[model samples]
Target chain A: GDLYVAGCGVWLPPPVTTEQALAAGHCDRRLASSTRMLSVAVADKETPAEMAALAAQTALDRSGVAPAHVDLVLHASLYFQGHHLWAPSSYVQRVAVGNRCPAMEVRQVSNGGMAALELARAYLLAAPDRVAALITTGDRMHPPGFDRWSSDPGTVYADGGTALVLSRQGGFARLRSLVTVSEPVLEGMHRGGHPFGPPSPEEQRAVDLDAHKRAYVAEAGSSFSVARVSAGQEEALTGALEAAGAGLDDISRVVLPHMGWRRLSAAYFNKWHIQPERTTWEFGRRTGHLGGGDPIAGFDHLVGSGRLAPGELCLLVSVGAGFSWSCAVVELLERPSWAAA
Target chain B: GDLYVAGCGVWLPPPVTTEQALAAGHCDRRLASSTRMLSVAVADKETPAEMAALAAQTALDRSGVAPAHVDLVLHASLYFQGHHLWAPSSYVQRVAVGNRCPAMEVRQVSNGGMAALELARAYLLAAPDRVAALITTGDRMHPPGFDRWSSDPGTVYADGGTALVLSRQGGFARLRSLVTVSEPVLEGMHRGGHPFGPPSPEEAVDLDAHKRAYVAEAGSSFSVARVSAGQEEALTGALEAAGAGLDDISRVVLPHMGWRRLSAAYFNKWHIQPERTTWEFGRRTGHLGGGDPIAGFDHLVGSGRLAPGELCLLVSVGAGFSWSCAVVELLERPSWAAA
Candidate 1:
C-alpha cells in the first residue's frame, strides 16, 4: 500500500517588513542584509495551539478525511504552549478533528514536524486498520523568552501554524520516502553550561542561542562543527533518495528551511550548486522561517500557488537542535480544485 | 510479533515526610490528612534528565542488551526540563546508551510514559530489523511554578525518573496487550478561558482551579461519567485483548495519587482490593509525575513481589484526560529479584 498526503494547510498572521523592522530597531542593517527577508509573520493574540487548530481545521476540511478515519494526532512545537501540565495536542484533537485518537506531543526542536511525520508513518504502518494521521507544528517565538531576530541571528523567526494529513487509504501526493539522521555528539551545540548537566533557566537569563553557538564553536572548533553538520544532512538526503530510488535531478522543486540568505547559500546553493529558482527560496524569504514549519508551509505554498505541477517531486528538508536532520521525497499525484492550472 | 519488557528501573531522590511539610506550612493539615502520604521523593541537586539517564543505565545494564541494539530513545515529561530548547532525550542517549539511535521527547501530560511505550511498540513493530527501544520518564515537579503538594490537591507530585526497555527479540515478561483511551471533550479540565483557545503561562498555575472551573461551567455529572468511562474502557479493552478479565490478574500497578482520588476513582468505584496493588509503596514514595506506572511496576518486580506465571495489569492516567492500561505476563524471575 502507498501513503498519501490527504491534505495540507498553513495559517499565518500579517508580515512585518524588514524596513519596518529596521525602523523599529527590531533588526539592524547587517542582519537585514544577510537574511534578505522581505518580512516575517508576527502574531498579536492567537497562541501557538490556537493557530495550529485553525490550520488543522483547514487541512481537515480540504482532506475530506472524516473524524473517524484519523487514528492519531501528533502536535510538534519548539517552545512552550502556555500553562504548565497542559495538553495542547488534546486541545487540538478536540477542536480540530474531534476524534478520540491518541493525541500526543513530539519534540525534536526545529526538526519536530518531521519527527511527528516519522512517528505518524510508523503508526499507520504498524496497524492494518489505521487510515490517516494529522500532524501539526506551531510556534510563537515571542519576546521575554525568545528574541526572534537576534536570538538565532542568521535565521529570522516567524509565527504561524502548519499541518499535513497523511493517509494510507488515499490524496494529491504520495510519500515516497522519509529518513532522519542524528549525531548526538553535537548535542552540546544548544547547551550552555556543562554538556552533561543542565543549568537552571535563571543562569542564562534568557534563551541566548547566539551565546550557546559561540560556546560550542569555541570548544568543538568551527571546522569540526561544520563537517559534522554537513555530513548528517548529506546522509539524511542520500538515505531518503536511495530509499525512494530517485536522484536529485528527479526532484522538480526543493522545499528548504527558511534560514537566511547567507546560511542557505553556504548550505544549499554554494555546496549543492542548486539555483534559487529550483527551490522555494523566493517565497520563503518573504515569509521567513517558521520554526519546525518551513517544509510544510513551503510545500503548501508551492502546491497552493500552482507552482508544483502533477507528476513532479518535491524534496522536503528540515533540521533541528539535537543536531538532527530529516529529508523526504514527496511526489505530487494530482492538484486540488483550490490550485489553478 | 509481540513486545516484551527486558528490564525496568527507577531513580528517586530522598523522601520528605508529610509531617515535615505540614510543620513548615508548605502543606495544610486538611490536604495532608486527605492524602495520607508518609513522604514524597524530592530532589536537591539532580536534574530530571540526569535522573532519567541514571535509571536508563541501570535498566539497559539489567536487560543485558548491548548499546548497539537500541534503535530509539524516547524520554517523556510533563513540566519544564530545566533549560529551554535543550534536548533531554539526546542527553539521556549520550549519557546512558552511548549509541547512535534517534532520541526524542514525548509528552501526553502525566500519561507520557505509557504513551512513549505505545509509540515504541509501534516503532519496533513497523520495522523488521529493529531490535529494542528505551523509554524513560522523569520530572522535577517542584516549587515557584508548581506547588506539588497543594497545586493538584488530589495527587501529590514528586521528583524522580523511571525507565523501561521494550524488545522485539526476547525478555523476561511478555506484553499481552496495551490500550489507550482519551476524552478530548474534557480537555477543558486542565484549561482556562475558552476551552480550546490559547491561554497564558504567566498566570499562576493552579490545576485545582482549572478542574473546579470545568466542573462548574461544564456539568459535573458529564465530566465525572466520562472520566470513569474512559478508564473503564481502557481496562476492558486491555483485558479483552489479553483474553483475561480483572479477576484473573494477580497484581495491579496503579498511579501514585492521593488517597481520596484513588479511593473515589479506583478502590470504591472498581471494588478492587488494595493489598493486590502497589498502594502501600506509592503512599510512602509519593507521586513521580509521568513515572507512576513504570516506577510501580519496577517496585513490584524488584522487590520480588510478583512471582513467575503471574499476570500484572499496569494502569496509568493523565490530565489531558487520557488513560492507558497494559497486561504483562511474567515468563521467569530475573537474577536481580530476591526469590
Candidate 2:
C-alpha cells in the first residue's frame, strides 16, 4: 500500500529577535552570535494543544478530507502538555476533526512528528478500510522553567504547532520513503543523573541542558558521544535516500533540523557539503527550533514559497533526545493553489 | 493477519493495605469503605522506566523471542518518566531487547497499554518482514504529586509495570480481535482550560479539580452518556469481530479500578459476575496505570484459569474518554503456563 501527503500546515506565533532577547538579558552576545538566529517564535499564553488544533484545522481544510474519513489523530510532543492525566490528542480531535478515530499521543522526543508519520503510514497500510491519518506537533518552550535561549545552547527553542495529513489516496506529494534510527546508548545525553548535577524542573528555577550533556559526556567520553550522534543521523539519512533511489545532489531541497548555525554546519552543511541556499537553513535561522515541528514547518515553508516544484524531491531530517533520528523523502506531485507559483 | 500473544508479565511492589492507608490518614475511612479495595501496590524508590524495563525483560524471556527478532518497542504510561525530554521507550529497548528498532511512547492515559497494542499490531501487519513487537507500561503514584488513594477518587492508582509480547509468528494464544473507541467531546473531562491549558506540573496534582471544572462546564449527564456509550461500542465491536458472545468468554480481564467504579461501569450495569472477571484480584492489586490489562491477562494465564480453546476478554478505558476491548483465544498452554 502506498501513502500520499494530502496536506500540511504550520501555526507559529510572532518571532522574538535574537537582538531583542540579548537586550532583554535572555542570552549573552557570544551565545547569540554563535547561534546566528535572527528570531524565534514565542507564545504569550497559547498552549501546545491549542496551537496543534489550529494547525490540524488548516491541514484538514486544505486536504479536503472529511472529518469522518480521518481514521486516526496522533499528536506528538516533547515537553509537558500543561496538565496531569490530560489527553491532548483527544482535545485536538474534538476541536479540529470533530470525529473520534482512536486519537493518541506519539512521542519520540524531537523526532516525534516524524515518528507519528511513520506509524500513521503503517496504520493506513495495515488495514484496507483505513484511509487517512492526521499528525501534529506542538511545544511552548517558555521561561521560569525552560530558557529557550540557553536550554540547549546550540539550538534555540521556538513555540508553535505543525500538522501533516497522509492518505491512501492521492495528494499534493508522494511519500517515497521514511526511516528512523535509534541509539539508546546516547539517551543519557539529555537526562544525566546526580553525577552531572541534573535538577528536576521543580528544583531548578530554569532548566539548563548543558549540565546534563556535560555530565553525560563525562561518563561517556565526548568523542564517544559525538561519534554515535553523527553515525545515527547518517544511518537514517542514508537509509531514506537509498530507499527513495536518490542522492543528495539529485534532491531539489533539504529540510534539516532547526539547530543553531554552528551545530548545523558541523552536522549537515560542512559534513554533507550542502550549501545553505539548497536547504531550509535561512528559514530555520529565523524561525528557531519548533521541537518536533521542524520538519513539517520546513516542508511547509518550501512548498508555500514555491521553492519546491512538481517532480522535485524534498528530504526532511530530524533528531530527538532519546538519541533517535528520522529521515523522510517526499516528491512533489503538484503545486497547490496556496503556493506562490 | 493474525497476531499471537507470546507472553506477558508484571513487576509490582508490595501491596499496602487500605486499613493502613486509613490509619495513616492518606485516605478517609468513608472513601476506603466505598472503594472496597483491600490494598494497593506501593513503590518506595522505583521509577517508571526501571519497572517497565524489568517487566519487559521477563516478558521477552518467557516469549523465547531473541532480542534481534523484535521489530518494535512501545512504552506507555500516564505520568512523567522521572525527567523531561527523556525517552523511556529506549531504556526499555536497551534493557530488554538490545536491538535497533524504533522505540517510542504511546499515551492515551489509562488505555495507553491497549493503545500501544493497537499500534503495534498495525506495525507488524503493515510489513511482512516485521516479526514481534513489545508493549510495556509503568507508573508510580506518589505523594506531593499524586495520591494513589484519592487522586481520581473511586479508582485507586498503584505502582507497577506490565509487559506483553505480540508476534506475527506462532505463540500460546491468538489475538482474535481488538477494537478501540473514543469520544473527544468528553476530552475536557481532564483538562482545566476551555480550549487548552498552559503547562504547569509544579503544582501538586489534583485530578479532582480538573474533573470538577470539566463536569461543571460539560454537564455530568453529557459526560456520563458519552463514557457509557463509548465503552459499549468497543465491547460490542470486539465481540463481533471475534465472532463470540459475552457468554462464550472463559474469563474477563477487566481494569483494576475500585469496586464502586467497576460496579457502575461493568458489574451491575452489564450483569457480568465479579467471579467471571478479575474483580477480587484487582481489589488487592489496585490500578497499575496503563498496565491493568497486561497485568490482568498475565495473572489469568499464569494462574491456569483460562483453558485451551477458550477465549479471554480484555477490557480497558482511559481518561481521554477512550475505551478498548480485546479477545484472545488460548490455542494451547505453553510450557511456562501453569498446568
Candidate 3:
C-alpha cells in the first residue's frame, strides 16, 4: 500500500513585538538575555476546528480531489471542542470536505499527526482501494495569565494547526515505512487530567524541564535497546540499504518536528545523525512548535521551496508526550512544474 | 458462527437501610410518604474494580470455563479511574483473568452491556470458531452525594455490576436474536461529568405525575404495538414452537433498568406481548438499572421453578436516553444442565 502527501496547510502565531512581550510580562529580561527565544505569530481569529478546516481545504484544493473522495477523516489534535456531542472531528471533516465520511479523532498528544499518518498507512494496507485519508492536528497553548516568562520552562509553547492529505496517487511523496516506540516511564512527562473539567490550582505550575530531560533520555535509550529494531534509517538512501534497510545518504531532505534550536541541534541532528543542512530550519522558525503540525509543515515547506527534487527521499520524525517516537520515510513521487524555480 | 453465553456474574449492593438513606438525605420523604418510592439494597464496601472482578469471576464460574480461555475482554462501564492511563476496563479484565488478552472498553452508557453482547455476536459471526469475548459492566452509584434521589420520580438508583461471557458453545442460554433502537431525546438524562473536578450542583429534579400519565397509555399501546414490532421474538418463538408465534410464548422476562411496575404494566405486557412474564422487581432494586432482559432473568429463574417441557421467551428492552430491544428463545437444551 502506498500513501502520499497530497497537500498541506499551516497556521502560526502573529510575531510578538519585543516591546509587547516585555510590557505584557510575557518575556522577562533574564531569559531574554540568556536564551534565544524564537518569536511566533498567532492567528487573529480562528478556532481549532476552523483552522483544521482551513488546512484540509487547502490540501484538497492542491490535490484536486473532491472531499467526497475521502473515505476516512482523522482529526489528531490535543484540544478538540466543537458543538456536536458525538465525534466532533467527523462533523468538521464532513463540513470541510462537503461530504459525509466516517471520521474519528486521534489524541496521542504532539505525535498525533505522525500517528495519524501511520494509521492512514495501516488503513491503506488493510483496505487498499480506499483513496484518501485526511490527518489534521492543531493546538493553542496560550491562555490569559499564561506567562511565557514563568519559571515553568515549557511554557513557551505556541498555537498552530496543520493538515495533510494522504492519497494512493498524485502525491509529491510516497510513504514507504513507519516505526514507533513508546517509553513507559516518560508517560507523565506531560499530563492532562480532565479536558472538560475546570482546571485545578495544582495545574497552574509551569512545565518542569527536568521531567522532560528524564523522559527524553529514557525514551531514546529504550527505543534503541528494543530487540526487533530496524536498521534502515541509519544508512538507507534512495533504494534498500541495511538492517533498518534504507541508506541515509539517499535521503535528500529531512522534515523534523519544530523543537527549539538547541534541542534541534543537540537532540535531532546530533542524536539522530541527520545533517543540519538537510533540515527545514526556515519553516521551523516560521511555524514554531506547531504541536503535531511541525513535520507535515516541514514537508510542505520543502516541497514549496523547490528544495525537494524528483525521486527525492524525505524523512519525518516526531516525539510526542508519553515519549512516543514516530518516524516515516517518504519518496517524492513527482515534481510539480510550478515548484521548479 | 454461533455465540453462546459461556458464563455470567453479578455484584449486588449491600442491603441499604432506610436510616442510611435518611441520614444521607438521599431518601425522598414525599415519594416515600406517597408510597411511590421503592426501597432497594445496595452493595457494601466495593469499588468499581472489585465489582468488575466479582462479575467476571461469576460469569467464568457459571460457564465452568477458566479465565485463560478468554481471547478478548471488553469492559463497558460508566466510571473508570486508575493509573497507567490504558483503557481501565481492559486493565481490570487483565488483572482478574490473569492473562494479557487484547482488551478494550466500550462507553455506550446503560445500553453498553447489550451493545457489547451484539458486538460479541458480530465478532463470533465474523470469525466463527476463532474467538471468545467477555464483557463486564458495573457501576457503584453510591459515591457519597453522587446518586441524586430527586432526579427521576421512581425509586433511588443503586449500584451493581454484571459480567457475561460469550463463546461458541456450552452455555446456559443461546443468544438468539438482538436488536437495538436509539431514541435521541433521552440523551444526557442521567450523566456524571468531570470526576476529578469540583462537583457541580446535582441535577436531579422531580417530574409531576402529568409527565408519567402518558406512560400507562403508552404501555397499553405498546402491548399491541410490540406484537408486531417484536416480530423477531414472535418469529423465534414460533420457530421454537414448531412453527407458531405469540401463542407459543410460555414465559417472558424483561429488563429491570427502573420504573419497574410501569415497565411491567406497559412495555412487557402491552408492548412486547410476552406470556407469563416474571417481574423480578425485588432482585434489582438499588443497582444502577442492570438493563437485564426480563426474559433472560425469567429463563434463569424459571429453569428451577417452571415445569419441564415449557418453552420460554426472553425479551429485553433498554431505555438509556434511548430504547433498545432484544429477544431470545430457550428450550430444554440439555447443555444448560452443565451451567
Candidate 4:
C-alpha cells in the first residue's frame, strides 16, 4: 500500500513585526534574556480553521490527490476553539476537503500528529483498498489577554499547523519506520483539565522545565545534557540518524524545531555535530516552533528548496509534551512533478 | 454465546430522607409539581470512582466473567471527573476490576453506553470466541447548586451506574437484535460540556423546557420512539409470550436508570397492554441506568417473588442526548441446577 505525503500548510500570528514585538510591554525583557524563547507569529489574520484548511490543501496539492479520494480524515489539533463539543476538527476537515468520510480527532498532546499517522497506518493496514487518509494538526496560542510573562515559560511558545496526506498508492516518500518513547518523569511537560476549565494557580505553577531537561538527559544519557540540551543537539540527531541506519556524515543538512539564533546554533553546531552552514536555520527562525509540525515543516522546506535529491534519506524527529519522542525515516522520491513549476 | 448478569449495585446520596426533601428549598417544589416522580426518598449518589466500580462489577458479574476476560473495557460515563485526561475512565476501570486490559472511554453523551454496546457487539462478531466485552456507564448530577426548578426536570435526576457483560458462553440471555434511531429534534434534550468543567450558564439559560416537552411528545409518536420511550413493558412481554406479542408477556422486569414507579407503570400499561392491574413494581426505587437492562438486579428482584412457570421479558431503552435508543430482549428460563 502506498501512503504518500499529499500536502502541508502552517499558520502563525502575523510575524510579530520585530518592531511590534519590541514595542510591546515586557516582550523585550523576555526576548533579551539568555534563555531566549521562540514565538512563531501566525499572520494575526487567519483563524484556526483557515490555517487547518490551508495545511490540508497544501498536502493534497503536493501529492496530487483530490479531496474526493479521502476515505478517512483524522484531525489532531491540540488547541481548537469551537462551540460543538463533538469532533470539531473532523467537521472542519470534512467541510474544507468537502469529504464526508467518518472522521475523529486524536488528542495525544505533542506526539499527536505521529499518533494520528500511526492510526492512519493501522486503518490502511486494516482496509487495504482505502485510497487516502488525511491527517491534520494545528494550534493557535493567541488567546485573549495572552500573557507572555507566565511563570511556566513553555506555555508562552508559538503555535502553527501541518497537514499530511497518506495514501496507499503514491510513490512519494515512504514512511519506512516510526518509533515512540514516553518517559514517566516528563509527564508534567504538558497537562490540562477541561478547556473551559482552568487549572488552579498552584497546579499551573508546578511545571518544572528543569525536570523536563533531566528526564531527557536521563533517558538519552549524559551526551544529551552536555551536547543536546546545552550547546549541541547531537544526542537527538545521532540517535535518530542511527535508528534510521544512517550517520551524521550521510546527512547533507539538518532542520531543527524553530528556535531563536542562539538556541538553533547551540542545537545544530554545538550538539548534533552538524556544521552551521548545513542546516535550515533561516526557515526555523522564520516559522518559529510549530510544535509537532516542526520536523515535517522542516522536511517540506527541504523539498521546496529542491535541496532533497532523489533517494536522499531524511530523518524527522519530534519531541512532544508527554515528554514523548518520535522519530521517522523517509526516502525521498524523484523530484515532485509539481515542483517543476 | 451466552451473556450473564453477574453483579449489580447502586450508589445514591445518603438517602435524601423524604421528610428532608419535603422541607428543603427546591426539592419540595419538584415534589409538589410532579406526581409521577417516584415517591421514594432515595437519590443515587455519584462519586467518580464509585460509579466506575459499580459499572465494572456489574458488567463483569453478568457474564460470570472476570476482568481478565476482558480484551477491551470501554466506559461511557456521561460525567467523568479525573485529573489525568488521557483515558481516565479506562484507567479507573482497570484499577477497580483489577484487570489491566487495554481500555478507553467513548464519549457520545447518554447514548454512549448503547454505542459502546454496539461497538462491543461488532467487536465480538468480528472476533468470535473472544471471552468477554464490558460496557459501563455512570453519571452524577450534583454540580454545586444544580437547579431543580428547570422546566425539563429530568436533567436534575439522580445519579447511578449500569454495566453489561457480553461473552460467547454461559449466559443468562442471548442478545438477539439491536436497532438505534436518532432524531435531530431531541438533540437539545440534555446538554453537557467537559465533565468537572464549569457549567455553561448560557446553555442552561437558553435551554427550553417547553420545547423539550414537545420533542419528547413527538418522540412518543414515532415507531422507534414507541419502542424506546413508550410502551416499555409491552415490548418485553411481546418477546416472551410465545406469539402473543404484547398479550403473551406474563412478567416484565425493569432496569435501574430512571425512577421505578414511572417506568413500571408505563411499561405495564403500554407494553404489556395491561389494564394497570397486572403491573408488579419493584421495591427498590433508583439504580444505575446503564447496566440495568441486563437482569442482574431485576433477576434478584424477580426471583424473590416470581414463581417458576411464569414467562418474563426484559426491555431496556436508553436516551442519548441526541434522542437515540437501544432495545434488548430477554426470555425467562427455568432455574437449572446451575441456577
In model 2, what are the clashing residue pairs, if there are any?
A82-B199
Worst 10 residues of 2 chain A by lDDT: A195-204
Docking class of 1: medium
Ranking of predictions according to TM-score: 1, 2, 4, 3
Two-way DockQ contest, 1 vs 4, winner? 1
| Each prediction's DockQ against the real complex | 0.64, 0.56, 0.07, 0.08
lDDT of 1 by residue, B58-128 (tens): 99988999999999999999988876777888888888899877889999998999999989998998889
For residues A237-310, what per-residue lDDT tens digits would candidate 1 score against the true structure? 99999988999989899999999999999999998888899899988888888878888999999999999999
- Per-residue lDDT of candidate 3, residues B1-339 (tens digit): 345666666666666654566777767566545323345556555555456667677667667776557755655543322221223343345345655343444434445565556545544543334456777766555443245354444445556666777787656555554544432222212222221111122221233332344234345464334433433443353244343354655555544434454454345546653235544443335434433442245345335544444444444333222233444444343334333
lDDT (10s digit) by residue, model 2, range A238-282: 999999999988898999999999999999989999888989999
Q: Return the TM-score for candidate 2, rounded to 2 decimals.
A: 0.97
lDDT of 4 at A23: 65
Best by TM-score: 1
Full-model lDDT, candidate 4: 0.48
Off by over 4 Å in 1: A196-205, B196-204
Residues A70-105, model 3: lDDT tens digits: 765667664423211223353345446755443445
> Per-prediction TM-score, please?
0.98, 0.97, 0.57, 0.58
Model 3, runs deviating above 4 Å: A17-23, A29-35, A41-45, A80-86, A144-155, A188-245, A336-341, B1-338
Residue lDDT tens for model 2, B43-138: 877778778888999999999998888999999999877777778888778777888899999999999999999999999999989999999999
Ten-residue region with minimum lDDT total, candidate 3 chain A: A192-201
Please give the distance, in angstroms, between residue B210's alpha carbon in candidate 4 and its true position after superposition.
Answer: 16
Give residue A104's lDDT in candidate 3 (0 to 100).
Answer: 48
